[PDB]
Amino acid sequence: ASLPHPKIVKKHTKKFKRHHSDRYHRVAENWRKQKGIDSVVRRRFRGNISQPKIGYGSNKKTKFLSPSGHKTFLVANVKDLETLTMHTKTYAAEIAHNISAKNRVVILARAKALGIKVTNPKGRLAL
Amino acid sequence: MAHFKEYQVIGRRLPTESVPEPKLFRMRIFASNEVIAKSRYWYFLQKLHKVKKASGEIVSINQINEAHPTKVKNFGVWVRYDSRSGTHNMYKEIRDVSRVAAVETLYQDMAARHRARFRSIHILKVAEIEKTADVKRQYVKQFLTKDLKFPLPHRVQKSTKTFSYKRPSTFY
Amino acid sequence: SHRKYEAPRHGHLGFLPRKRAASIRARVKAFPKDDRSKPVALTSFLGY
Amino acid sequence: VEPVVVIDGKGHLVGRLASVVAKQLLNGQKIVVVRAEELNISGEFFRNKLKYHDFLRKATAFNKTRGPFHFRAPSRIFYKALRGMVSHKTARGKAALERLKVFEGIPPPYDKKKRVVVPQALRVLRLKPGRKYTTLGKLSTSVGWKYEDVVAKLEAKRKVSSAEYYAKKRAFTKKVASANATAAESDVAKQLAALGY
Amino acid sequence: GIDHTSKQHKRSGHRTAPKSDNVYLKLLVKLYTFLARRTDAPFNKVVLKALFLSKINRPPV
Amino acid sequence: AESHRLYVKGKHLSYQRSKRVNNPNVSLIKIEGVATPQDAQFYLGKRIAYVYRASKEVRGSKIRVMWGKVTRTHGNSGVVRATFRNNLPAKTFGASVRIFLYPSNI
RNA sequence: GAACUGGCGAUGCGGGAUGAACCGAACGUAGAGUUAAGGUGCCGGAAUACACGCUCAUCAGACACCACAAAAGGUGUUAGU
RNA sequence: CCCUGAAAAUGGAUGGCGCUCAAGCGUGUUACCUAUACUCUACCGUCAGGGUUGAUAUGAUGCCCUGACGAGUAGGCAGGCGUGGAGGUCAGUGACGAAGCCUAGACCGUAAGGUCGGGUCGAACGGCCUCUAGUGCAGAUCUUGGUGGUAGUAGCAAAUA
RNA sequence: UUUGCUCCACACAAUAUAGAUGGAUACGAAUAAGGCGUCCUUGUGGCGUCGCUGAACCAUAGCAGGCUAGCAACGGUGCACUUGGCGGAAAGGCCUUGGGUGCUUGCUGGCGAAUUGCAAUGUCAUUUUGCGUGGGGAUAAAUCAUUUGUAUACGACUUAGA
Ligand SMILES: [Mg+2]
Ligand SMILES: [Mg+2]
Ligand SMILES: [Mg+2]
Ligand SMILES: [Mg+2]
Ligand SMILES: [Mg+2]
Ligand SMILES: [Mg+2]
Ligand SMILES: [Mg+2]
Ligand SMILES: [Mg+2]
Ligand SMILES: [Mg+2]
Ligand SMILES: [Mg+2]
Ligand SMILES: [Mg+2]
Ligand SMILES: [Mg+2]
Ligand SMILES: [Mg+2]
Ligand SMILES: [Mg+2]
Ligand SMILES: [Mg+2]
């Protein structure tokens, strides 16, 4: 597997959705801080949505780690994949979205031969 | 509070060069603890003599226990208290087995019948009545008759359970 | 402010609602008190 | 303990019984209340009739059929007291309310079931002797309940049938106790007495 | 709650490093940081602090 | 025999709550035959099962269990506080739970 | 319309049903324990606790800010001079 | 304490139900309930005080040790996210499918956002270090354009047919 | 109107559970009074006894309860078959009679259990529904359209029509 690590605690799995993005179509879900003078969200009235705070920060030991325990590194070619040769216990390769299928076959073959875990090996597989 | 103790508190003015060995004034104070006893002592010395806690001293505080706690006595109690529109002196009689218990009953009774708090009451004097025919209140005299005996009609028994299967009775 | 001239109400509040009757035959809602000493008899009749 | 609890409402105080029953239903106990017409309210009859007339005069001004409803039957006066003691506008409170049945008299099948009392709501245990009290069937009749007499007739004939049942049961109980008397001073009886039975 | 007698999270108000990006100045700073840490001479501390100073705070001599 | 019970009957009353805020993480359990905190102290640490039925067979059964334990006494009348691995659903306010005799100290 | 101080504005949280200012207490994210003010018949978490009295109102009473009551009067009832 | 004094307009408010040796009033002793408050612990950030070079196994704005602290409009400052274009670089991605668009499918970040899979599509487009600005919208009876409910509703009833 | 509908029984499948897990175990009145037993001259009677909680009473032992042999009494319980009687407040239940058929832990034996591996509800209930099997049972209406005007804005109502 990956390097041993403590249990990963998230401290907030629920997405921080913008106030009234469920009310109006024009208000997107991307988080925005309410700045109104009277806003109940800004004033933190009970029963309202929670706002992002630095106290929600992830434990630095487990930060950026996937559930499998690897940090994700985006690769576009074999040479990009080769940089993880000595870091197979801490990093897993992820193949970029715009890599062609025939180049993905080569990347996957090299990754299997070197022992790098690929996050998305089923992308663009012919069958 | 109502778990009253009786303390003797003896104090004096702070000794000076002109008058060493002051006169050692003493009171009997009904209070829940010694801190309150000492405070009540200074309050009363404050009111009677030209002395205060700063210019004075507490030489002794001692709890006074009942001589015969298991001997039913009759107590005459003289109190002075403040009503909503004046100050009044009262005399009351308590049948009880100790002075602290009698004072407890007195405070409960003053609170109940005259809405007088502990704040408003001065205990002037508590004295055992040495013999009958000196008891002046009928609510105490009625318990001094020979071979006194009374029933307790309509006994209500406390249930440990929500439901009962038997339609309880009040015989006793 | 008050009505400024008193007048009795228009119509009777006890004949409400002023809706169509449920049936063309109005129903008898009370019959005469029974008296067991008299012979058996009908309390009402139907006609047109 | 038992799946259904049948409370004889005779001689109970309405509010204290309603509080007990509300807690039972919310805790998940099925309750049937019988003889609601024999429930008691503290205070004199005139005073409680005045209170009910104050309740009667509260109605929605622009439409009386959507206003507060004034149910006259004793079982409904008790039910109304238990509401307001239950959060009836929620699903949990509604679920508690389907756990309750209230009747005047003792209709079947409860007329042959065991009835219980709630001692903490019993008038004879709660009220001070000499305090005046009201009877629910009499208050309901003065308010407009129509069925006091038919309930009384049905209660009288139920009491007759129950009396013959009790006479049969008392005779059988006497002979069972007689047989248990003959079982004494035997070795099995002596051992059971030693063990506590 | 704490009845704070002083402002919270207050920065010291003194430079801990040169504001510049001169690499040779940063090498001098790291040299005198090592000296100021591993020696008890207050000269090294004084020189280290002076290495952080702005232009108006280091007038020509 | 006709009886096979090895647990003590209990009722799930509510969550821990103030007047207007509840805490789903702690449940209040009324154990039958317990009227004082002194008697409730015997049940501290005892395992609790909420047993319910589902239409879908999962692992060879249509019966599912929620497991928890008694943590402390509650109030003056023998009610106890309990915690479950997953909090009780809150439609079970008034439902029956089972308090087993293990872990046992007798 | 001024004075001192504390607040609200700029502030959520527990309590006062409800409420800018009152009471308690001021706030990173969680766990456990203990409390404040306020409460513990039921709604509602928590004693239909314990104890001494008082009150029956054919318009009882039921917690500060606060959502009012007076002069006067009663062989109602209680204590007292 | 209770009662009289004590009269207002929709039906209503010790919060409600109700409560009468109280679930009322005065008082007293305990137990119990629960705040984002207090205590202890973990984690995030900030601030402060420190350690670390006979090469610290070549990152010293790094790694690490210790303590305390964390409300916030107007406002100040800091570190970051995102967009069009420019220099450099990855001899980066791509018709074996770039960009775009849809996706109660997955992953990373407190967040701005980033990444991946699937569908559609057809010609260009990214990462990083820097440079630059016509660089981020929910409001302005905002501009232009498009579209609803109203609603199959009002209306299509003057001038003889 | 598809071999449709309905009731009974067993077989399967689905569906859900406001929440079985020994038994809801029946006088009526009073509470400054009652219950029960007994006797008499039958009462608002005499005598005795009881309560001070259901902490009771009843049920309760057996591979979740197997197989088998006896002893003692003719009892206790289950299942159908039954003879009746009572119950209308929502009766839908209660009291019975007589055989049969199992079980009996009232008392003595004999055989079995294991490995679910040191716990995991460890599944033992009961609403509802459909598809089947085999045994009884019965053989319509309403609406639209037309029509009336005791009705009527339209719906609706009220009439008529093999
Ligand atoms: Mg997340
Ligand atoms: Mg506003
Ligand atoms: Mg504001
Ligand atoms: Mg009427
Ligand atoms: Mg302003
Ligand atoms: Mg208020
Ligand atoms: Mg508030
Ligand atoms: Mg203060
Ligand atoms: Mg209350
Ligand atoms: Mg409660
Ligand atoms: Mg969408
Ligand atoms: Mg594409
Ligand atoms: Mg083209
Ligand atoms: Mg612009
Ligand atoms: Mg816009």
Tab-separated table of C-alpha atoms in Angstrom, chain F residues 18-92:
chain	number	residue	atom	x	y	z
F	18	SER	CA	-32.404	21.544	26.517
F	19	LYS	CA	-35.773	23.278	26.084
F	20	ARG	CA	-35.203	23.967	22.380
F	21	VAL	CA	-31.961	22.220	21.305
F	22	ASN	CA	-31.486	18.456	21.187
F	23	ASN	CA	-28.314	16.364	21.057
F	24	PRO	CA	-28.843	13.291	18.838
F	25	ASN	CA	-25.522	11.830	20.016
F	26	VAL	CA	-26.954	10.942	23.461
F	27	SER	CA	-30.212	9.052	23.983
F	28	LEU	CA	-32.342	8.807	27.112
F	29	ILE	CA	-33.466	5.294	28.044
F	30	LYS	CA	-36.066	4.300	30.616
F	31	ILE	CA	-35.289	0.816	31.921
F	32	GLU	CA	-38.280	-1.118	33.230
F	33	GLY	CA	-38.160	-1.698	36.977
F	34	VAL	CA	-35.617	1.076	37.668
F	35	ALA	CA	-36.770	4.087	39.680
F	36	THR	CA	-33.613	5.620	41.212
F	37	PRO	CA	-30.091	6.533	40.073
F	38	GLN	CA	-28.820	4.082	42.690
F	39	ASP	CA	-30.652	1.261	40.915
F	40	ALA	CA	-29.657	2.621	37.497
F	41	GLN	CA	-26.002	2.332	38.537
F	42	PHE	CA	-26.227	-1.457	38.147
F	43	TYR	CA	-26.904	-0.958	34.429
F	44	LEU	CA	-23.993	1.384	33.668
F	45	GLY	CA	-21.920	-0.021	30.829
F	46	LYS	CA	-24.517	-2.611	29.848
F	47	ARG	CA	-24.899	-3.161	26.117
F	48	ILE	CA	-28.089	-1.980	24.406
F	49	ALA	CA	-29.615	-3.227	21.168
F	50	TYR	CA	-32.327	-1.522	19.170
F	51	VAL	CA	-33.760	-4.327	17.031
F	52	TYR	CA	-35.890	-3.453	14.011
F	53	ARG	CA	-37.127	-5.091	10.828
F	54	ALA	CA	-36.561	-4.134	7.200
F	55	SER	CA	-38.108	-5.344	3.966
F	56	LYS	CA	-34.705	-5.986	2.329
F	57	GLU	CA	-32.602	-8.996	3.279
F	58	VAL	CA	-29.008	-7.854	3.611
F	59	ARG	CA	-26.749	-10.552	5.094
F	60	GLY	CA	-29.195	-13.426	5.299
F	61	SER	CA	-31.690	-11.532	7.455
F	62	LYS	CA	-34.460	-8.944	7.442
F	63	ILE	CA	-33.594	-8.016	11.045
F	64	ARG	CA	-31.160	-5.210	11.840
F	65	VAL	CA	-29.578	-4.069	15.092
F	66	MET	CA	-28.217	-0.759	16.360
F	67	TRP	CA	-25.705	-1.285	19.168
F	68	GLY	CA	-24.861	1.019	22.041
F	69	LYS	CA	-24.264	1.111	25.761
F	70	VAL	CA	-25.420	2.789	28.956
F	71	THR	CA	-22.993	5.569	29.906
F	72	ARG	CA	-24.433	7.256	33.019
F	73	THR	CA	-27.594	7.781	35.024
F	74	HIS	CA	-29.973	10.619	34.164
F	75	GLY	CA	-32.155	12.607	36.521
F	76	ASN	CA	-33.650	11.223	39.721
F	77	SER	CA	-36.078	8.583	38.429
F	78	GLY	CA	-33.834	5.841	37.045
F	79	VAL	CA	-33.517	7.187	33.496
F	80	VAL	CA	-30.093	6.584	31.954
F	81	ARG	CA	-28.045	8.138	29.175
F	82	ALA	CA	-26.877	5.876	26.361
F	83	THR	CA	-24.686	6.188	23.290
F	84	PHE	CA	-24.936	4.119	20.114
F	85	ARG	CA	-22.405	3.556	17.341
F	86	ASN	CA	-24.899	5.309	15.080
F	87	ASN	CA	-27.406	7.587	16.779
F	88	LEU	CA	-30.952	6.324	17.185
F	89	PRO	CA	-33.269	7.428	14.348
F	90	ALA	CA	-35.619	9.576	16.574
F	91	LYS	CA	-38.737	7.982	15.126
F	92	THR	CA	-37.982	5.428	17.851
